[PDB]
Nucleic acid binder design. Sequence first.
RNA 1: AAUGGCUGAAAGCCUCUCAAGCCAGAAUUUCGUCUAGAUGAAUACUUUGUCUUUUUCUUGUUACUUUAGUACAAUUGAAAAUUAUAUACGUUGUAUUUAUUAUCUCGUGUAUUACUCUAUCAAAAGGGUAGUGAAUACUGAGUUAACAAAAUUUAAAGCAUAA
RNA 2: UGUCGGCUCUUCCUAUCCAUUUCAAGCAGAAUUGAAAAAAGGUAUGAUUGUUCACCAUUUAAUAGGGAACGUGAGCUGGGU
RNA 3: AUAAACAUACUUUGAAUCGGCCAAGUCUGGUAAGCAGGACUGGCGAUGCGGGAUGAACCGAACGUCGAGAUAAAGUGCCAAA
Lengths: 173, 193, 204, 106, 130, 251
Amino acid sequence: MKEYYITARCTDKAHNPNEIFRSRVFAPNYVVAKSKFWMMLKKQHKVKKINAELLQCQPIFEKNPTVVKNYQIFLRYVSAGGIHNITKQYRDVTRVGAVRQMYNDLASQYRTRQDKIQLISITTVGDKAVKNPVLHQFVGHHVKFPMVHCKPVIASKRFNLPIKAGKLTTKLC
Amino acid sequence: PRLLKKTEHVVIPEGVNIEINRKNIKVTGPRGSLTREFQHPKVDIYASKLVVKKEGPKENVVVIDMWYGNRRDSAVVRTIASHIKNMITGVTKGYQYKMRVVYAHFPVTLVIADDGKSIQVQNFLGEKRTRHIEMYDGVVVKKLGKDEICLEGNDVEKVSQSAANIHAANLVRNKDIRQFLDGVYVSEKCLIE
Amino acid sequence: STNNKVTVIDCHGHVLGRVASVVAKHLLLGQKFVLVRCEDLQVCGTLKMRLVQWELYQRKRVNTNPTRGAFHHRSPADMVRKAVRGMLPKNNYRGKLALKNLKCFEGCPAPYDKMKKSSIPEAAAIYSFNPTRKRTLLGELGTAVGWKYADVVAKNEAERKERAAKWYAAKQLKQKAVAEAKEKILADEKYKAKVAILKKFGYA
Amino acid sequence: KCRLHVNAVFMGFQRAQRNQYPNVALLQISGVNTKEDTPFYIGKRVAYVYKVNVKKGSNKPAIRAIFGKIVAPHGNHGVVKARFLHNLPPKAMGQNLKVFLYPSNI
Amino acid sequence: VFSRFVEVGRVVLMKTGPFASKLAVIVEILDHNRVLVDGPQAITGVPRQVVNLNTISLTSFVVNKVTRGMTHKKLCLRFTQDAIIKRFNKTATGKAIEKRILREKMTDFDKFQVSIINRKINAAAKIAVA
Amino acid sequence: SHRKFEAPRHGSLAFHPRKRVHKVRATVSAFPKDNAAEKPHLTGFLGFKAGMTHVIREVKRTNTKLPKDGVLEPVTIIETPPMVVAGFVGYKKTTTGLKPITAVFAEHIADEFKRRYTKKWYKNTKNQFAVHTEKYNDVKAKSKRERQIRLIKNRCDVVRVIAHTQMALVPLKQKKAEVMEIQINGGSIAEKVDFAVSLLEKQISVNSVFGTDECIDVCSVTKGHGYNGVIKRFGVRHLPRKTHRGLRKVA
RNA sequence: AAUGGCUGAAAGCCUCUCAAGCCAGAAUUUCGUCUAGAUGAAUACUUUGUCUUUUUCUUGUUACUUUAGUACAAUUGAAAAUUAUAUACGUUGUAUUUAUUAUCUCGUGUAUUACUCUAUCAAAAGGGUAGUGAAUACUGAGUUAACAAAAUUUAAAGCAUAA
RNA sequence: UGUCGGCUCUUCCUAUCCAUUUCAAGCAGAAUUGAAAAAAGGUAUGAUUGUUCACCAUUUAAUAGGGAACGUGAGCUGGGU
RNA sequence: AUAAACAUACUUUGAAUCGGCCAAGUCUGGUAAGCAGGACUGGCGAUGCGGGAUGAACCGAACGUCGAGAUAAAGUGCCAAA
């Protein structure tokens, strides 16, 4: 998942050529990002590739990919019934990181493939504005829990022997 | 949703001694001992000192702790806390279950062994079959008045089941139970002391 | 070379299917296996569910001749051989030879009770199972379906635990004296030259 | 006298689900548990030494060998491909081969 | 009660990756599976990054006065103030890390010496006990 | 299609296959469950059927309408001369069933017992139990016997006595005995072996094994009939007279 | 099992549990019992005591007869239980195949052993006691190797006697 | 590929007629009716018709419904076709 | 614009064939049919190979005899290579 900044203009009779369209598209690459941009223009402004010119498709990188932020995503998806608007919250350090969580979560809980979800907007909210029942328990200052039933960790695949010697034990870590 | 931490506690009175060995709680009180096992693989039982009154001091408690876990598993924390609370009450003020015999026409005679470890229900609805109903270990039957008995013991689970075994043995069959109101019924459950 | 030594697997606290899959692959690789305590293996599902699966398994039977039909072995040492045989090649010399190097026993018999036991980490019930999931020992299921020798095994295992208790206590006494005697050799001054070499490489 | 080799198991031939190509043999070297340890063994010598119960009237040796080389890794589990002068007999599946320390690059 | 907790300030050891067997400090808990370890990059060389809890192990030390989202400058001050480096090397797992480093640079001659020497010492200790 | 009318099947499937036995003597499949809280005693015997008579017996039950003068009933007479106990064997409970550990025999053995171990006695050298009897009193053999007694007392659960008949007392032309193992049900394995040792070379009469008015179980081989058709073997319905190719078969 | 209940949360109360834990309950299931039965075990006698193949006698089997070849006592392989594991530690990071400093000789006694063997007490024991040898530690000193060779793993022929 | 029915015989299904265990009723008792577990065991004798089917007379705890080349002709019968 | 000289235009003589069948982001009659009948294209027939356990048509891809590699459909707990 990568975020892109795309701009274009329309040169025809219907649209004046002094209006520049901007957008921020999340896509695995710039080819997919352009496709999401062109369809957004065509379904909302009657602008087609054969009558428009692309200008910029530069990527957007996270400014500080070391600060943990609570992201809020406003999206709309299509189910068997109809089309719904949802708002989910995730804790990650990058904008493209949270969108990766959103796509995996939606395809699991709602069984919705990626080609039914449109991401309207993604923002950042405060600590106390997280209403996710599970995620509300980690936004505090004094979160603490022991990870029990740890499986012993292997440094690398080199020591991954099929049959071991002696008894086996978990870890309280 | 999954709760990050669910916890419960039970206050230990003075005349009660509690020791724990791998989710196995033994409670010793003035009336005796009571050993029970709690084999839930996701519950941690340990005794600590806690302040439970809003403005009270520290006191000895047993802490039942379950970390990250769904609502199906989390419900076992208050179940185990109730069991330990019941055991503490059982060895301090034991339980007694008073049952009353109800008949319409045929009188029912209860024959209790000398040791109190067994009963005998005779002429229930005129039946020639005599019901025995054995009693669990630590539960003793006695006759309070006419058509009334009570079961004494330290374990609520043993006393309650033994009382229900008496009632279950005297069920009317192939008859209108709304008309044939017969049998032995638990009038009330209370503490000895 | 030739593998003549026998790999001994302690089937205590392991999963039936995941032990068989690892054992079946390595039987084809020429190894010799002896799985002791094949009655302590665990399977998913409560006793009621396991009985429903067993009763369905017992249904399959040749109508015209039940003596030709599927033979439903009830001993846990035969519930593992069936599981292993399913994962091995059928109807060729390669499959028969691979199965010829496999044994389960319901306990630890005379020659295999003093052998170095191994374990299969992939098949451990503490890694592959949610702890809340209810399981069933193969020995407990065997009794419910008609395995008569479940209490004979519990007698033999009890006498094996108590005989290993005195051997371990005596061994721990000797090993403590040997460890303390070595500390005197390490601290000795005549062995100073050798000790410095061990300290240099961290052995001491 | 001394052990100068690592025992390797003749798992089988390079095959597909319903095919088999006996030109390339697959070996499992003892101690290699990933494909990142195989680069040491690429090019080393491999021998399939076996015993034949000859008669007293024959000068044919009782011990013979088929030699080969390890040429490439095979999957992410440290399984190798070995090409021999004569393809190994499938009766020798599951047997132990010798992985020598030469031609050495150390 | 459980002894070691996943919290803020807890010192952890990276068991896999490019920084295996290196110390780290937890300064933010994203969720039940992910934590933000910033084991001071100036001291132990572990960059500020998000790791999964299946790749670390809890130690017995907690850095005092470490709050969530600590900066690298302040965190380095508290790491050396508590003397985590010295305390870690005295523990059983700290010694085993050094032994792994000690034994990996053992040539065949060195292995030959220690194998011969240890056999005699272990035999000599066995003789002494009556 | 469904059968028009319903009827029980002919013949029992609990006695399938119908295979004729090889030995005239029939071995009991089990002995009554052991109780360790009583004195040792034998739980079986062996006799030869003589014939059948009828008796008039006086009814002692109450609340019955049987005639007061007696009821005619059949009886079977089984001649049971005394047995000669010629050894004992201890069985151990393993994970594949009872396993005989050792068998200890007496010093003196009759030729009736020795005849079981040959198939042409008149051509045999008749040297059965020769080395066991000749070297019975040697110091080496006495130590071995003492070990067999102690081995059974330590690692056994079931003790049975190898008792054989005396066929010189019955009108049968057979001379070789009929060996039968009679389990000892009673006290602990210590006092079971003590009782079994006391019975060595002795004779057990049926009055010691069985009581009066005691209900017992009888196991024996039935009367042979040979090749028989479905009508006799199972009891199927004979076919109508009009039938081609025969009447006494299953259609 | 259907069903009736006990304790009991979830959900401060209630609840037989689409929760953990229990009880009673069928012409039911499994032991027990009856029939057939695979690999098996014990004892009695005849033997053999490093071993086989091919011939050959017999109704058939074993032991047996002949010509050869092969090995020759001595370091192998065990804690249990739990995993939300009394506390502490996390003891990190290669299971079997696969852990011996070439060879022989010379030197002093002590000590050690899941070592070999003998005698004995026991024993369905990695058992006890006494002796003997082996290997190892204290702990040596010397000989020799250069080219060749350092492998059994079983192949051929007979029927006198005995069971 | 021998085409109906009946006779003989075995097995299987449950969408259960009886026996066993339960819940409900406008279940007072008796007789009943609806429903669950359960297919291990039983489920008949005759007048008329070639009949499957049907209708009568009894008996029974009940006299339930079906499949297996519309089970079954080198198994029978040959009444029908 | 792109392609096309072993391109293009053919002439003569003649073989076999006109029982067809399947798929479907297709249609008509029919309650419906592995039913009956049609429009367009691709296939089976005439066709093997790798995969779907097995299969005339599905997916990949069409075949002189071999060696070495990168692949396609599709898969990587064991049968079974990963």
